[PDB]
Design a protein around this ligand. Sequence first.
Ligand code: SPH
Ligand code: SPH
Lengths: 49, 242, 242, 48, 58, 58, 297, 99, 49, 245
Amino acid sequence: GFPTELKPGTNQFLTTDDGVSAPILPNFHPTPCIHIPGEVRNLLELCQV
Amino acid sequence: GFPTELKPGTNQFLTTDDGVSAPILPNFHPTPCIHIPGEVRNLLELCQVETILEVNNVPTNATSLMERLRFPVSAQAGKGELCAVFRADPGRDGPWQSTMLGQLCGYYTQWSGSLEVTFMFTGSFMATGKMLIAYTPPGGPLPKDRATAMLGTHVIWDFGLQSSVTLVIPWISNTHYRAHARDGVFDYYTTGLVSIWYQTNYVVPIGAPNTAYIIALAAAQKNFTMKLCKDTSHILQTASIQ
Amino acid sequence: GFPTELKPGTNQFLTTDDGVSAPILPNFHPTPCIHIPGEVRNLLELCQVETILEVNNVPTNATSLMERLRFPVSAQAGKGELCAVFRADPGRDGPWQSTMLGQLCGYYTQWSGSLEVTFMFTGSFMATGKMLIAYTPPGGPLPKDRATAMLGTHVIWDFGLQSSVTLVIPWISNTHYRAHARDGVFDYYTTGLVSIWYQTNYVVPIGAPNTAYIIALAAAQKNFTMKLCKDTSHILQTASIQ
Amino acid sequence: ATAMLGTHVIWDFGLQSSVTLVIPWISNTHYRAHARDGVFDYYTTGLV
Amino acid sequence: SHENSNSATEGSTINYTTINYYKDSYAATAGKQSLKQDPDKFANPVKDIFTEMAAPLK
Amino acid sequence: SHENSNSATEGSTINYTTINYYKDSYAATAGKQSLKQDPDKFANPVKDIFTEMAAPLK
Amino acid sequence: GDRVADVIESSIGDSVSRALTQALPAPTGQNTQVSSHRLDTGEVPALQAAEIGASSNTSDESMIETRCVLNSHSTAETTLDSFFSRAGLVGEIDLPLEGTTNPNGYANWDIDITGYAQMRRKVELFTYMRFDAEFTFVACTPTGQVVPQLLQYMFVPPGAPKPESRESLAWQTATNPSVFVKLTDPPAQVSVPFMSPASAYQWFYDGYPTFGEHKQEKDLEYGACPNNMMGTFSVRTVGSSKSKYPLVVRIYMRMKHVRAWIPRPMRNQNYLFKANPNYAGNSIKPTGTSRSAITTL
Amino acid sequence: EIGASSNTSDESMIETRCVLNSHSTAETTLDSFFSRAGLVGEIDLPLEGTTNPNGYANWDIDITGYAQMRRKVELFTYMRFDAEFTFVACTPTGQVVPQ
Amino acid sequence: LLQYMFVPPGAPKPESRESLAWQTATNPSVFVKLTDPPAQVSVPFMSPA
Amino acid sequence: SDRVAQLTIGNSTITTQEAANIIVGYGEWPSYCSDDDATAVDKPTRPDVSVNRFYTLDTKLWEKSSKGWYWKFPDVLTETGVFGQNAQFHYLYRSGFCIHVQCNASKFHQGALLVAILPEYVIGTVAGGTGTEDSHPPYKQTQPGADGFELQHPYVLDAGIPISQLTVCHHQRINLRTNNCATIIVPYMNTLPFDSALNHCNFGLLVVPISPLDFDQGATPVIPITITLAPMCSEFAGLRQAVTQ
Ligand SMILES: CCCCCCCCCCCCC/C=C/[C@H](O)[C@H](N)CO
Ligand SMILES: CCCCCCCCCCCCC/C=C/[C@H](O)[C@H](N)CO
């Protein structure tokens, strides 16, 4: 019973909030990524086109 | 009053969530575990086990359901004739449903790796014969003759003391993993075909029987893995259990 | 606003949950504890205590309820006759209900270990006798005679100055632990039987009484444990207390 | 069924066309005399 | 760390390991007790003990 | 740290990494198991093994 | 002490288990190595003897010309945790107002997870399984409506008194474990240990529990293991009077810390009963799909 | 007659083997036997009747009104403990209401 | 109360509300009340590619 | 070097000239009960040679119209020799086994038998055929003894489980053109260190023809199948009167 107080901002879904969510598939390692050409890392690579 | 904010994902029961729950019996030590033999640690220990592949899955009546575990080989005219043909797809509804691989693949969505089909000759010691067992990779339709089939991966099996050959169906795929195929756009994940052709003939002496049977045994290889656990589809239950 | 997600198991009162609760009286130091004798630290200190086993649990009227604590032994014809027989099951509804073992076992679901039954001869100094006290492990039905009973675990007790023998009922079981037995599939957890047979006779001189009584005293051994605490079944309460 | 409780050999015919059953010394006396119908059946060795 | 030692078991040689979020020790978890026993206090409470093999009435 | 070792897997050489907030070990997370295998226990359970290139019936 | 030679040179009392195999780490799938052509005699890896009862030790390096493939496919999702640590329906309890099911406001449920085919066929892949569990109770109305009602979930182990009513004396939970919850709350979720007097549960028991004659009367006892009868689950509406809401309690079990032994064939026929491997003998269905002929598809 | 219990073991009554026991005595302690919440009191607050028709109720604290927790404590004559009380409030029907 | 079941490819789709696929013994699921915050789960890269 | 075998245990000896190999079950040889795994405190009797020896049960005939047979262990030896007296006189039992199945035929005979060990082979029934009756098997079907019992529906093994996945247990084949013996060595498999031999059967032994027997008119039409089995590392504990069931 570690005491806490819930502050406002509680039980809202903010679309631009970056937090941890619960995973559905434990011990799932994905398919490995091969080297595909054309990798984008920033949209300013394309504004200079 | 340590301040907190409750985030979404709150007061939901996700079945595949692994967390700490409250214990009902404190200071409960269980019964000790004795050494029991047969301990499983991974289901890939069992996918590497040879189980019977029901190639001759024609009969349905109860009188003749044991006939599905062996398929015949007899005397022919020596024209390179066809004995049997089946798909190399484990999850597809066909011969592989009888295997432990084809039932533990129902509980997984994506598989990768090489397979293994072992045919045993159950004829007389005096009976001889040679057979061509061709794996036809995808794109290749059903070969109409043996000449079209020897262009693929194949084994020529000579009957003898060693009554069993192993055709390895190797991983020849575009994707690293492969899902379950069916009639539609998931034929993209088809694995190919496997056909058996008479190479020379089934030669037998006088006094011995003119017919024998071959029992196929299918498993997986050491590079085999499954992925994305799910629920099985190719077995279902009529409701009202007990 | 430290973000959190509330998981299931939330806002439930589990009675066997051991956590921190809020205190009502801050800066309350209690009364000091003096040295009181008789401090208990484990209930197995009390399961090792000899308490009276009601073998002769025949009478029910209030006039004759003290007769349940001693059973008779008298003069016979010398044919190896039967005195008494009872089950070695503590949780089963029978003689062991009178013991502290048979009441603290109601509060536990699984027990293991050896038992201990101590019989005391409460006759004359001049009375002699020899008796066979046989423990019959499970499978063995009720022995019809003494020859069938001496094949089991047994003690031959000669009356004398030491007026008491101890039959140890040892742990002879398939399971590491053993639950409470009853008529049904839980007879799987039966422990066996205990029978008392006349070995020679109850010999007595003239002037002394022809009959005596034996008081049985049952406990547990140092290897005894109980497990999986529960609520007791073999005592219940008519409602409307006070 | 009554005979397999004794000393026995199961012989499979094959290339080796011969088995050997060893009748071993299972006796009360260190030595054994010749048997016949009577009290010298005490020195019987058994059956095969 | 600094806390009122005001539980019902403070003042005994038995070592507990409790959890608490308060200043009072009696609000803590029950914890694990020591697994010590004294059956002879009830089962062999005699002045002059006897051994197993011996006849006690000597 | 001090905790009842009363899970169903305590007593094996396989190493787990669980999370717990209680004194009972069986309330913990399942965790990651060791990725060890023994297929020969079912797939090659023979007294006298054979190699791949050899003809086994020798 | 031992003097005669047959007793000194004896293997009696060798308790150490002599194992042929050893478990090695396989975190990934086995890599493929480079192979070339083979044109010799004697070495013939494609030919096997399946009569030995072993599986083929033939690889694809010996059947075709192969390349090097450095595999990084993980075997982590085939473990028994990842395969069984997935909550599934093992029980369902109905608490109606009128009818026959449970018209008084309490319900006892003999714990057996063999009443739902999708979790049963997963466990009956093995004959012995040892695990701790995590049960979760999702309570609701028939329509799925969450209502303001208090309940009590009492675990009644074997031997303890079962409640004969809602006003019963067993509900005082002085020693049996219990959970009180409102339906408006998240579902109750408790962790349970391995509680068998044996070293593992067993889904198949080839035997009878009791001695004696086995006639047609006591033939129900065939297959029953008391080591798996873990007791009773009881539920009531906390109150002295009659509730106003119908209710359903659905039970979901998740295994953790799993060990399993002795794999079996998997059930291909439809189950019919609880803790009974019976089948419909007239309507025996083949394990998979069928064809018109063996030379076609 | 000494009033002690028998010090006889099974090693002296039968030919025994070695058994390395790993059965724990941890669940017989007094914490594990008593640290289990049970009913010790019940208070009714009705509207009409005789029990408590005014809206308040006083309860003289005694845990000897329920047989299942009483018979557990009366195994001893003296018991010293700290406690944790829990109050489960509800309507007769079990309905949770905004009060 | 609702139940959000993920049905991967190959697994049986439910033909009804009373269906047998809803037992979620191996497929992942989320139970939620509408009175709760919205369910939020994290998903991996699940492509065979 | 591998087709020849001599199995010697006790006062008994089997020869074979046309073997495959020996299957050691789950890679565990039979052993004795350790003091850590043990719970019962009585000293067990370990009769080395009087119970660990090959016993020969009976002889089944492989006809054309055969379906299969099963035998339950240790029920096959509870009325036979010194084993079946120590097992009746005692309450507890622990043993491994070496099973050895014999079927001889010519080189002009063809056929195959699957010889498998199925632990906890619980026997189901047809449930009336419609699946409504909750029928049960009688005692002469779950513990049939040394006579064994003939499978009604060997596709599902009279338990609703497919024969095709039965190679996941121990097995050998008897292919008449390759071998005539099948040798499996089984350890004690149970959740408990000891158990009753009369109430509980640890495993079953299935003998099923996958490929049917065939021969031409003139050859020996009687092709017998003989079961021959040896306990291993036997142990008995808890002595009382002899009860048979
Ligand atoms: C509020 C407390 C509720 C806690 C109830 C948890 C019950 C614990 C039981 C878990 C173990 C289940 C094992 C079941 C085995 C099979 O059903 C049997 N072999 C019957 O066929
Ligand atoms: C909101 C605050 C409520 C807190 C109320 C807690 C009361 C504390 C009392 C606990 C001690 C109970 C001991 C009772 C002993 C027996 O009833 C007496 N010997 C009477 O027979």
